[PDB]
Ligand binder design. Structure first.
Ligand SMILES: Nc1ncnc2c1ncn2[C@@H]1O[C@H](COP(=O)(O)OP(=O)(O)OP(=O)(O)O)[C@@H](O)[C@H]1O
Lengths: 54, 101, 250, 217, 381
């Protein structure tokens, strides 16, 4: 709505994507997954406790 | 604004349902024709708000055939396509208001 | 920034919508997510409390104050405006209905008297709007369970469901999906907890969450038993333990 | 079985349209849609769904029509066409724009999109859906959701075989509830094939599928 | 219209004396039921050769009935004032009567009146096609050819996307019916998606035929994408016996199990190629091709095989193999020679520089022929 909505509008901009930033469990879970891949982790505590707490 | 030399003025309304039928018809002909000929239905049922609106309906209905890997549209697709385009136009434009009156 | 007309409250704004009134709403948003759900047989109001300092006591921060024993209030916003407004609500009501009509107000009448106070802190120049928007949830005999919003402007409206604060968007849609008025109260309490639980997930412990019902009378809490005809208190505030019971029912 | 089931349904669909609500006629059609799917009649099950469907395009939103799309999705996977399996995931998602739907409605929603990406040979996308479904089934009443918790547990395991990360095969496997209560023959199956794939021993894989043969079946 | 394809295929089983005696008479009862129902007296005279006068009285009667009905109607309509519209709708009903009795000639005449007064371009295309159908009913393909030509003139004059789908299927059938199986393979696989049921040989038949044209034309690679993984064929499943027989055949080819291929070939010949009229004439073309295509794929994977080994796999004798392969070698797809004495089948296939030499020298010779003809001509003139 920083852009004028009447002028800049669907069919110039027919896809207008809102990104989740409030985010779901799955969406969070994938981001943690980028890290989980990058280096092995020594299990010493629950992994999923951290997700819920975010 | 003030007198000077401007005199002729032409007023353009946003489309009516009749005019909407015309714009929609001719793009569908060039593209892939709406089968069961319910492009007339779509215009009768509702008004968009612009001819820009109408070209957006045209694109989306066609994109729905693409997801299936079909190359032809049907009425079922326009009925989905219209609700998506038109409703999105309303949810971006209403958010500005708080709760006044 | 804005006009000198719109800062003034004795001066018609260009738009006609004061800058002031709009500031009051920006602040409401900034506060806690508070909600109200109307049931057949009750009203539940529920909110989260400020965590404040670690060693600041949480209990003493009260975002639900009983106006009368049968009618409670909930707000989003600042503490100072809340308390002053609250003394004024009770006080004006005593004069105009507890001595005249020698009884507790209808919910509608109390809501009407709260709007008027509000209205005067917006009319008089140089006195800012109350920094707070209310829900006044309540019970009276005549018009049963009732649910209200009172705006710092001094307009009020009854609702089926409303929520205010940052998480107002989220909450309202959730209530719609899961519930309608015709459903019982018991279901709504579980629902309301879940709704508020989207808001924050770090702690949802019954210490930081204040949950109350206005519903049935409690003839125990009448406090001068042996006379039954007087209505007991409609309002009963549910303890932390009680919340925790209601969390395992979710 | 077939005989008892089919006769009762037919008889039942007539009372509703003759004296009671058109609502009642529609509830019984969801029963009939499930019955055909179990006969492995996927032509018949699509034809039945379709007779209704037009009058319920109007009424599209109800959790009960969310389930009709979900069933449709199933029906096209087993017909092995993924043109319309994909198409029918979209419809399900449209008619649950609000994702606040019941617990069982949500389990099935996650699980169809997972299986769809299995065929698409993406096992990053597939794995993630399975996890959310994992949790739904455990917290559900174990009327039969205890057996279906296991089926999702095998699908979690399956993704990670494909990606050939045996670290996460040991990670999932725990003494929390996986090897306890959701223990099956097929838990042992998945971790055994997983070790064979890693070594590069086709010989080991061949042995594993003889004794886990009923698991493939 | 609708009964004509059903009538003719039953009539064709009865004609054949190849098929089981049971099927021939099972078909007798069925064709008879429709003969009476539609009054086929002019058309019965064609069918009785090729394998009551009441049918004729019933005829003639149906003639004065359905014949008169339309007449006096047509006249009241020509008197009444709207010329363009009303007369032509009535002439469409006129063409329907001749089309019921299986007379392709008089149907053409009255439907010509219908067109004559101006009607919607789209409507003219529907009408031309109706005539076209009756050409399959007689089995006069030459008749279909010219009718279908007039439609393609009007298909893009109109813009009709609606009638384009029908034309695809009818043209599929045309190409299928004729010896060119190339165009057929293309036209018909896309008629699967755009199948229009209205006056045409059932959906089940189309699906079987698409597979047949698939197998003849398309490379092993090109079969996999377009026929096996073809989403429609998998949606339609195998229910009818003919679909099952042809489908199973496809599969064992790709999977290259050549224990099960040759039993399926025998099945498709009995139950699919011979009873379908179109594929009775092309039975020979199709089965000779299938034998060559499977054997070609196996030779490509082997520098050398034994005769006993190739044969044993198929489930034919060494003697049998030796004859059947020597038919196929001089037509040149197999590209092998057989050492009888050593018993080896050695395989010699070029893939080198020689490939690019042949293509060049041949194309460039075809160009020179043209330069001479044209140059010499223009000098004279
Ligand atoms: N006193 C005046 N002298 C001349 N024409 C006048 C007079 N008063 C009115 N008009 C009328 O106004 C008409 C248009 O004037 P025009 O708009 O060219 O003038 P201007 O005042 O020079 O402005 P601009 O350059 O901004 O258009 C004239 O043709 C005439 O009809």
């Amino acid at each position: 709505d920083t852009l004028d909505p009447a002028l800049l509008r669907p069919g110039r901009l027919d896809r207008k994507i809102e990104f989740p930033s409030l985010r779901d469990r799955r969406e969070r879970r994938l981001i943690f997954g980028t890290i989980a891949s990058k280096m092995s982790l020594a299990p010493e505590a629950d992994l999923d406790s951290l997700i819920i707490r975010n | 604004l003030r007198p000077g030399r401007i005199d002729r003025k032409i007023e353009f309304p946003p489309p009516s349902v009749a005019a909407r039928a015309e714009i929609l018809r001719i793009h569908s002909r060039k593209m892939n024709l709406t089968r069961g000929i319910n492009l007339r239905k779509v215009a009768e049922k509702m008004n968009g708000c612009s001819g820009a609106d109408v070209k957006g309906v045209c694109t989306e209905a066609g994109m729905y055939a693409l997801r299936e890997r079909r190359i032809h549209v049907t009425q079922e697709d326009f009925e989905l396509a219209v609700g998506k385009v038109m409703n999105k136009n309303q949810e971006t434009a209403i958010s500005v208001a708080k709760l006044f009156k | 920034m804005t006009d000198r007309y719109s800062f003034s409250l004795t001066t018609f704004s260009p738009s006609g919508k004061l800058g002031q009134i709009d500031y009051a709403l920006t602040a409401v948003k900034q506060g806690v997510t508070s909600l109200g759900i109307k049931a057949t047989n009750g009203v539940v109001i529920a909110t989260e409390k400020k965590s404040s300092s670690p060693l600041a006591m949480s209990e003493t921060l009260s975002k639900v104050s009983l106006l009368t024993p049968d009618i409670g209030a909930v707000y989003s916003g600042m503490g100072p405006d809340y308390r002053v407004l609250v003394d004024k609500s009770r006080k004006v009501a005593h004069t105009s209905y507890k001595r005249i009509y020698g009884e507790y107000p209808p919910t509608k009448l109390l809501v009407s008297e709260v709007a008027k106070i509000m209205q005067e802190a917006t009319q008089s120049g140089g006195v800012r709007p109350f920094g707070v928007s209310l829900l006044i949830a309540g019970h009276d005999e005549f018009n049963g369970f009732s649910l209200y919003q009172v705006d710092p402007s001094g307009s009020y409206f009854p609702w089926k469901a409303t929520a205010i604060g940052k998480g107002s968007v989220a909450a309202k849609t959730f209530l719609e999906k899961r519930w309608n008025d015709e459903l019982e109260l018991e279901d709504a309490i579980h629902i309301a907890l879940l709704t508020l639980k989207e808001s924050v997930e770090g702690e949802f412990n019954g210490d930081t969450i204040e949950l109350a019902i206005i519903g049935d009378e409690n003839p125990d809490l009448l406090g001068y038993t042996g006379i039954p005809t007087d209505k007991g208190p409609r309002f009963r505030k549910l303890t932390s333990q009680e919340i925790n019971d209601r969390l395992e029912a979710l | 079985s077939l005989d008892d089931q089919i006769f009762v349904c037919e008889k039942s669909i007539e009372f509703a349209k003759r004296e009671k609500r058109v609502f009642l006629k529609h509830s019984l059609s969801i029963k009939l849609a499930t019955l055909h799917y179990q006969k492995k009649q996927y032509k018949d099950s699509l034809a039945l769904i379709n007779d209704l469907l037009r009058e319920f395009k109007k009424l599209d939103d109800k959790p009960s029509l969310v389930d009709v799309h979900l069933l449709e999705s199933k029906v096209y996977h087993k017909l092995r066409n993924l043109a319309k399996s994909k198409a029918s995931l979209t419809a399900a998602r449209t008619a649950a724009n609000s994702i606040y739907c019941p617990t069982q409605t949500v389990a099935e929603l996650d699980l169809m999109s997972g299986i769809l990406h299995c065929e698409d040979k993406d096992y990053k996308t597939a794995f993630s859906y399975f996890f959310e479904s994992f949790e739904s089934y455990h917290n559900l009443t174990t009327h039969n959701s205890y057996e279906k918790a296991c089926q999702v547990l095998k699908y979690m395991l399956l993704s990670k075989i494909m990606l050939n990360l045996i670290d996460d095969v040991k990670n999932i496997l725990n003494a929390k509830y996986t090897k306890e209560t959701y223990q099956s023959r097929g838990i042992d199956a998945m971790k055994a094939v997983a070790e064979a794939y890693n070594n590069r021993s086709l010989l080991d894989f061949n042995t594993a599928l003889k004794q886990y043969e009923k698991e493939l079946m | 219209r609708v009964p004509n394809y059903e009538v003719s295929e039953k009539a064709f089983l009865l004609t054949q004396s190849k098929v089981s005696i049971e099927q021939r008479k099972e078909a007798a009862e069925f064709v008879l039921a429709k003969i009476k129902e539609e009054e086929m007296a002019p058309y019965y005279k064609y069918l009785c050769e090729e394998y009551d006068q009441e049918l004729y009285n019933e005829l003639c009667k149906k003639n004065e009935s359905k014949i008169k009905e339309l007449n006096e109607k047509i006249q009241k309509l020509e008197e009444d004032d709207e010329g363009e519209l009303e007369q032509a709708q009535a002439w469409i009903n006129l063409g329907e009567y001749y089309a019921q009795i299986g007379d392709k000639d008089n149907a053409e005449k009255t439907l010509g009146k219908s067109l004559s007064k101006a009607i919607s371009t789209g409507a003219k295309i529907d009408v031309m096609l109706t005539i076209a159908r009756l050409g399959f009913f007689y089995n006069d393909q030459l008749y279909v050819k010219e009718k279908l030509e007039a439609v393609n003139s009007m298909i893009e004059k109109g813009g009709d996307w609606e009638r384009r789908n029908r034309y695809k299927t009818y043209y599929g059938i045309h190409c299928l019916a004729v010896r060119n199986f190339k165009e057929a393979a293309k036209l018909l696989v896309d008629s699967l998606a755009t199948f229009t049921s209205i006056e045409l040989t059932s959906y089940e038949s189309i699906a079987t035929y698409a597979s047949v044209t698939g197998l003849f034309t398309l490379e092993r690679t090109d079969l996999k994408s377009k026929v096996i993984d073809s989403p429609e064929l998998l949606s339609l499943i195998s229910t009818t016996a003919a679909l099952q027989s042809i489908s199973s055949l496809t599969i064992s080819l790709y999977a290259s199990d050549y224990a099960s291929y040759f039993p399926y070939l025998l099945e498709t010949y009995a139950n699919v190629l011979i009873p379908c009229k179109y594929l009775n004439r092309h039975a020979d073309f199709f089965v000779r091709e299938m034998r060559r295509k499977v054997y070609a794929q196996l030779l490509e994977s082997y520098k050398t095989l034994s005769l006993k080994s190739m044969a044993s796999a198929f489930g034919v004798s060494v003697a049998f193999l030796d004859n059947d392969l020597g038919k196929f070698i001089p037509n040149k797809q197999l590209n092998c020679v057989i050492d009888r004495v050593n018993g080896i089948v050695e395989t010699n296939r070029p893939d080198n520089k020689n490939a690019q030499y042949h293509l060049l020298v041949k194309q460039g010779d075809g160009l020179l022929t043209k330069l001479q003809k044209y140059g010499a001509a223009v000098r004279l003139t």
